[PDB]
Nucleic acid binder design. Structure first.
Ligand code: NA
Ligand code: NA
Ligand code: NA
Ligand code: NA
Length: 327
DNA sequence: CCGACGGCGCATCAGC
DNA sequence: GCTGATGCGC
DNA sequence: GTCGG
């Protein structure tokens, strides 16, 4: 549905969502507004009243009232007021820096640090992640065109295989579902030598090779199972350099790898449905495994999984290509 | 009425 | 110094 | 803020 249908309403709900999360620190209200904005973003009719909208799941009395105010006046008094509040607008804004959440943003504003310029002047008050988020503030907010994701995947798959041809790596996320653009790169990695009941260097080896070839440029965090950093495609030698991108790499036990690939491929709506279906079939599916449920609710030991298809077979469901997992 | 609304790895803090 | 909580991101 | 047991 064209963003012109109810774009005004969804923009308003999204803006409210952010202030709830970043300023009032009410994550649940944040999610409530986002859910309301989503259900509304998919409604194929230009809303004529709050009552019409209220019929939609996720939209209640309060948002119904706000929609009536918006339609009649073209704005929301509360939103207008908070938008112009120097302290709140600054807190909300500062959370756009990766690493700065509601707490840090609040602390910074409390002491006069309100703009990116102010952060740049106060380096010693920023932890490592935050300095990285600041350095690439602009790049991190840019999307990644699928053509660049493919080039990124090329490098990742090649280097991983170069380290050990036995590794198995899968780039997931919307990219795996075929999206024309992505917000980042999520890589799932595994190695036959690593199972649930079985080296603290499998991930390190891969991250190191990616750094040696200068693909990975910075590290936000890195442990034995999860790496979060920054990467960048090589510049054409004479063409404007590519922007830096966010990349995560997760090492998962082989016996849990496919449940993981299934999960991190989504979409979110699809996973919810699949887990719902699985339940009504006597199975419980989380990001790690799929286990049988006894007649009394007691979950049994995890079932053998050797491919995404195995998961679908257990719950009597035809395998659905990532492309068809929009929901 | 009133609790659920995602759970967990990693960096860093808070307390001992 | 060790251990648990907290902030943050996903 | 919305849902629902
Ligand atoms: Na509703
Ligand atoms: Na942030
Ligand atoms: Na943010
Ligand atoms: Na080999």
């Amino acid at each position: 549905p064209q963003e012109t249908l109810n774009g005004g309403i969804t923009d308003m709900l999204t803006e409210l969502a952010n202030f709830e999360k970043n300023v009032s620190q009410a994550i649940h209200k944040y999610n409530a507004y986002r859910k309301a904005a989503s259900v509304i973003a998919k409604y194929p009719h230009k809303i004529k009243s709050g009552a019409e909208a209220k019929k939609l799941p996720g939209v209640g009395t309060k948002i119904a009232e706000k929609i009536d105010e918006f339609l009649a006046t073209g704005k929301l008094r509360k939103l207008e007021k908070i938008r112009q509040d120097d302290t709140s607008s600054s807190i909300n804004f500062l959370t756009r820096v990766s690493g700065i959440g509601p707490s840090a943003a609040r602390k910074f504003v409390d002491e006069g640090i309100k703009t990116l310029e102010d952060l740049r002047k106060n380096e010693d008050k920023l932890n490592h992640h935050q300095r990285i988020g600041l350095k690439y503030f602009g790049d991190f907010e840019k999307r990644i065109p699928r053509e660049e994701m493919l080039q990124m995947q090329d490098i990742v798959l090649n280097e991983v295989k170069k380290v050990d041809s036995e590794y198995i790596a899968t780039v997931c996320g919307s990219f795996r579902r075929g999206a024309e653009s992505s917000g980042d790169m999520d890589v799932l990695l595994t190695h036959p030598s690593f199972t649930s009941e079985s080296q603290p260097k499998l991930l390190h080896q891969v991250v190191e090779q990616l750094q040696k070839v200068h693909f990975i440029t910075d590290t936000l965090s890195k442990g034995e199972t999860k790496f979060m950093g920054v990467c960048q495609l090589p510049s054409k030698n004479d063409e404007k350099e590519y922007p830096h991108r966010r990349i995560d790499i997760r090492l998962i036990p082989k016996d849990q790898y496919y449940c993981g690939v299934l999960y991190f491929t989504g979409s979110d709506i699809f996973n919810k449905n699949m887990r719902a279906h699985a339940l009504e079939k006597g199975f419980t599916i989380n990001e790690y495994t799929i286990r049988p449920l006894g007649v009394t609710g007691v979950a049994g030991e995890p079932l053998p999984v050797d491919s995404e298809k195995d998961i679908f077979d257990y719950i009597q469901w035809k395998y659905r290509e990532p492309k068809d997992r929009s929901e």
